[PDB]
């Protein structure tokens, strides 16, 4: 994620990979959505299930 001039950009690529975790083989990222929020962001948090 990033917030250059608003325009919230989200990139992703799924792969039940090696399964190890942060793997090593190279992997690009395919953007999914790009939506112009244009607000101030400084802190970040994650939700659970």
């Amino acid at each position: 994620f990033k917030n250059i001039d608003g325009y919230f950009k989200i990139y992703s690529k799924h792969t039940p990979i090696i399964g190890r975790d942060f793997p090593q083989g190279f992997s690009a990222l395919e953007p999914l959505v790009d939506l112009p929020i244009g607000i101030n962001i400084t802190r970040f948090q994650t939700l659970l299930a």
Binding site: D5, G6, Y7, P36, G38, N40
Partner: protein, 145 residues
Amino acid sequence: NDLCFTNVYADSFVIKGNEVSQIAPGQTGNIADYNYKLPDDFTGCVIAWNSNKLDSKHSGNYDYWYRLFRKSKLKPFERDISTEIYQAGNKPCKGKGPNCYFPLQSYGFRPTYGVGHQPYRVVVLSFELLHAPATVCGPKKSTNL
């Protein structure tokens, strides 16, 4: 009317006469530095028309607001809505009066000022001419490829 823009941002606000001259890429002044700042590589339009009929009445009207006291400069296209008293000297003072000043003062408007003090209604239009699926266009023909 013959371009394609990805997205358009319309920012609208009433400012005074000299402030119209102030509003421009990278200008100087307590509006350009603490109230609103356009990016230097701005690609858009600024619109300003006189409004003495909607921002004025008998006995005056002090509804509007503007900031003169900010801890730092204003980054382009960033809002700093907040009511924090400016620090003076080294006092953690929280209040009005001496060396404890309210950041924002009235933009008081009356039907009888000078042109430089008249209630100019300013709206700015921001375009994004980059390589992306555009949204906004004008007249169009759909000749077959």
